[PDB]
Paper text:
Copper-containing nitrite reductases (CuNiRs) are found in all three kingdoms of life and play a major role in the denitrification branch of the global nitro­gen cycle where nitrate is used in place of di­oxy­gen as an electron acceptor in respiratory energy metabolism. The catalytic type-2 copper center (T2Cu) is located at the interface of the adjacent monomers and is ‘hard-wired’ to the electron-donating type-1 copper center (T1Cu) via neighboring residues that form a Cys–His electron-transfer (ET) bridge. The two active-site residues, AspCAT and HisCAT around the T2Cu, are involved in substrate binding and catalysis with both residues starting in the deprotonated state prior to substrate-binding events. The hexameric structure observed for the N-terminal cupredoxin-tethered three-domain CuNiR from two strains of Hyphomicrobium denitrificans suggests that it is likely to offer an advantage for these organisms.
Author numbering:
A (entry chain C), B (entry chain B), C (entry chain A): 26 to 448
Write the structure that this text describes.
């Protein structure tokens, strides 16, 4: 699995004993916590040395253990599949440590993990929620309506956040026009907004990429007109100070200006954007999460996200396709600060529109592409066979801050292209 | 304005009251500070929860307010245009907090902010200070003279730093030759230098890119000859240990090696380089700033700068051009550590010379290009209309460490490419 | 030299006197430590102000000195060539400070520094250790054997670390097949492994890029068959959770799928991968280094390495080539988290295979290329002349965490391409 269930234990002294102490999640600060797991789940346990004696963790029945960690902060992660139901001791095997208190239970329960009923609006943009290709057609005047909306959203299972959005979702509406078009932009800022909002389009030519004409008071509306002079895949974002603050809170999206021919036909298109959120409390903390200004200006986020939320493209709104389809992903980074090393595990990019150029010839046969903040690209590939394909930033520590996504494709396990055993 | 006046407030207990406390700038550690602002200026207020009670900041006559912030370190920023002259109360709206002492005054003064008289040397290279296109001509021997100079310089309004430079400015002189040219380089280390200085040209072939031949004692001169074998836009930099130290202090420049044809004809060329400075005290602290080794080797800078200084390309040496003109920016990253997401707000790159290749086809219709430390690129675009165009690193938290520049182009606010109402 | 001997001194109060205190390496916590150096070494001294009085460091016989550091954490670094054998005082020139105790000895000893005798296995891959170009030949079944081995490795001179590897070295085996080939992969997990291991190939099509078929218990074997459908230079890595943990401990390599025509003829090929290691104690600490989870998940490493170790490509297994040879470097980033700015000091890349595409035309005349984690590229250049050419990540603070390599080429100092003095 690429969604392991994760527990963090720090060694320490508590309740008059030498113990394991739970760190974050549902086990924060509990001593020798019960690790509750569902049958068939992959379990990851991170052991961190708290007080500076030698330690490990061992679960006899799964032939699983950490390495021995010796000094303060020394760490060892191990994993296994929870294949047998029942109750199992995790313990420290160092002389005396089990007797002295270093012992807890892993409970493997039958059936599938139930999802926590949500407490706030779903702010996640479905990756299929974009307009299809524009027909061949003359250049013309297009009216676009955006509303800036401030609202609490479901950031994770049991954690909320005050998002700022275009039309109550992250990313914002996928905008699709043809080069030469005249865009009539209307920006309504909701009555219940505390902040002024605006929009800079990277596909617009003139002051602030429209920001100078879109500074909108709450309950007010701006109207601006601009020509789409250049074909490309452009990120748009709020441009009201603090711009980094407006971007982290959710105010980014993509503007496709099709070239005259349109893009090469493909069977299926998807909308994906990466960003960071900068919270006071670390990744995995339950409750209302709040923004930490010191962490934002110092570029030290706690969440890395596809389309606004943890589980956005795994649990709530994943990608779906059929064997033999050509797939296109519009992938942009709102940021505000981090470059994505975009990759799909189990696939290779047939075409990569380098630096989001739609007019230059695409690069071919590419594993991984750098996309900067305030940049996008286009990738396509043919699905030659079935699987769960995984979208990642290949700076892979971002898996542990919520950045993973699923492309689900129905096919047999084994075939000519990849199979168990020899040829 | 894309240069808002920024104030940071931490809530706390001080002078026997529950108060706002100034953080950085002119208001550092003052309780309930007076925020002084000039008519028309954009004002940004950063509120940070200090002691852990619920707080906001409210200014009534501007219908401006932070969000409510609950736990320690929780934060909200808000902004507005200081369109109204006089004195206005900023205060906390939570039951009792204003009575308990959470109140200060915003003073809006008529007229424009006067410039601070400078303590130290202007070390900013004018972006228009470069030699123009070489004619067509035969390859030949070219003499180049560099001087390595240690001098105190104006990092910011009230703040100085010890710069290490090529010829007293940052970046160093723009060197321009043709492929085939034999370069006769004279490097003179000034008598009053403490340090050995040198140079490595990324456009030279041989040991240390000339560094092995140019290790120059203070008060001495070395001479080195090298052939420009490959066309490109190259960074040069000091190559005396510690090389990161000599770079952060400002010893970086660009060398253009023109291809046979020369580069395409353009109306106007500009010289811009990005670097970092690693100071003991945070961004905005007045006085002599000093270098912090721990922050240098761990890649934690306080300043992100175009051409040496805060306000380099906004206040003291901004960029000027006329509507209808095609513009080329030679953009390099001295670094020493951070990759730039280079972008011009309100413009699109007609051409981007990928990884600084002068011989491969440029990519077309690009919003944003990654440039690594020790790398450079060329961008160009036609100025279809007038406005303030803004050079940024689209890692936009670097806005709050000094990274912003202006390209000023005279023209009407409203026109066919972007305008106020509908069509 | 581009590998200086480095000493850090913090000023403070110890043993009843105002003194210098050693930081890190052989001098950690020693007062006025003896700085022992071999004749001809380049010496870098980092002064850090500890207690807040004014300090410098002066060595009279070498005309060498720091600048004056005033505030706590204020830093100045200086360098010189230890050209003179004997004992030289380093001392603070501020009034009284020398008399108050700020004085130590620099000892310069004749002859070269002996290498320290290792304690653990050599785990660095020789950059020359790769199979050469495959003939022209028909597509066929190729069998590959990989063994996952956990073992202590010589990380630095007197520091060790528990590495996880493919076949006992970092990077893993260079895999070379022809496009159209069928790969029969055998992965054996050694009996003495604590952990499950696996492999994902970025050049395989299907679930986990083979990870879904290769989750192998200790003392077990897995077998998977897959078709090489795309030509490219692909990273492969372990894909057992924690994937970031498995990668940082050393489980990455390169798979070249040759195109039918082969890569261009070249005189000499090399294998180089860049990674990070996240240790509890800082770079330079002797003894057993252990893994720091908190540093891994927050992207804050202590070691930046080519091919597994400090000195990997300078002392133990450097690169050798001859003047006039065309050279190819296959360069990959295992990571797990940092984008490399790959540069060879003294050279310029004739060709850069952008995003590791082997089917799109290579870019020409490039100084420096961004390679993401889980990305790879090919550079080639002609060696016109002799020198030590230096492999670096141009994020040059990484010089101070172990990231440097040597390409040694026998030839004269002075020729027509680069010489001392004028024409
Ligand atoms: O295979 N990439 O995580
Ligand atoms: O050439 N720079 O390391
Ligand atoms: Cu124990
Ligand atoms: Cu906004
Ligand atoms: Cu932008
Ligand atoms: Cu209050
Ligand atoms: Cu220098
Ligand atoms: Cu360099
Ligand atoms: Cu002193
Ligand atoms: Cu592994
Ligand atoms: Cu991968």
């Amino acid at each position: 699995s690429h969604a392991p269930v994760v527990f963090t234990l720090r060694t320490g002294i508590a309740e008059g004993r030498m113990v394991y102490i739970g760190v974050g999640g549902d086990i924060d600060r509990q001593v020798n916590p019960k690790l509750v797991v569902h049958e068939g789940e992959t379990v990851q346990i991170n052991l961190i040395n708290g007080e500076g004696a030698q330690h490990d963790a061992v679960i006899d029945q799964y032939a699983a253990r950490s390495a021995i960690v010796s000094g303060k902060n020394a760490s060892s992660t191990f994993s296994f599949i929870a294949s047998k139901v029942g109750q199992f001791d995790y313990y420290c095997s160092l002389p005396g440590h089990r007797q002295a208190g270093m012992q807890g239970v892993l409970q493997v329960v039958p059936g599938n993990r139930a999802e926590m009923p949500s407490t706030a609006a779903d702010i996640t943009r479905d990756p299929a929620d974009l307009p299809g290709p524009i027909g061949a057609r003359q250049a013309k005047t297009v009216r676009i309506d955006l509303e800036t909306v401030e609202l609490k959203g479901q950031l994770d299972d049991k954690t909320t956040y005050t998002y700022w959005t275009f039309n109550g979702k992250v990313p914002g509406p996928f905008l699709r026009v043809r080069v030469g078009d005249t865009v009539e932009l209307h920006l309504k800022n909701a009555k219940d907004s505390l902040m002024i909002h605006s929009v800079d389009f990277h596909g617009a030519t003139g002051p602030g990429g429209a920001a100078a004409y879109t500074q909108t008071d709450p309950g007010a509306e701006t109207v601006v007109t601009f020509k789409a002079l250049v074909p490309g895949i452009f990120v748009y974002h709020c441009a009201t100070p603090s711009v980094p603050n407006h971007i982290t809170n959710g105010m980014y999206g993509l503007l496709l200006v099709e070239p005259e021919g349109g893009l090469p036909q493909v069977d299926r298109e998807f909308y994906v954007m990466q960003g960071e959120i900068y919270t006071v409390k670390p990744f995995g903390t339950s409750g209302e999460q709040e923004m930490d200004y010191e962490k934002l200006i110092s570029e030290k986020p706690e969440y890395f996200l596809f389309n606004g939320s943890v589980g956005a493209l795994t649990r709530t709104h994943p990608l779906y396709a059929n064997v033999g389809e050509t797939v296109r992903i519009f992938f942009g980074v709102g940021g505000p600060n981090f470059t994505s090393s975009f990759h799909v595990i189990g696939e290779i990019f047939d075409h990569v529109y380098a630096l989001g150029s739609v007019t230059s010839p695409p690069l071919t046969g590419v594993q991984t592409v750098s996309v900067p903040p305030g940049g996008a690209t286009i990738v396509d590939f043919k699905l030659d066979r079935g699987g769960r394909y995984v979208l990642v930033d290949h700076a892979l520590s971002r898996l542990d801050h919520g950045l993973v996504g699923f492309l689900n494709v129905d096919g047999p396990k084994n075939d000519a292209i990849m199979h168990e055993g020899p040829p």
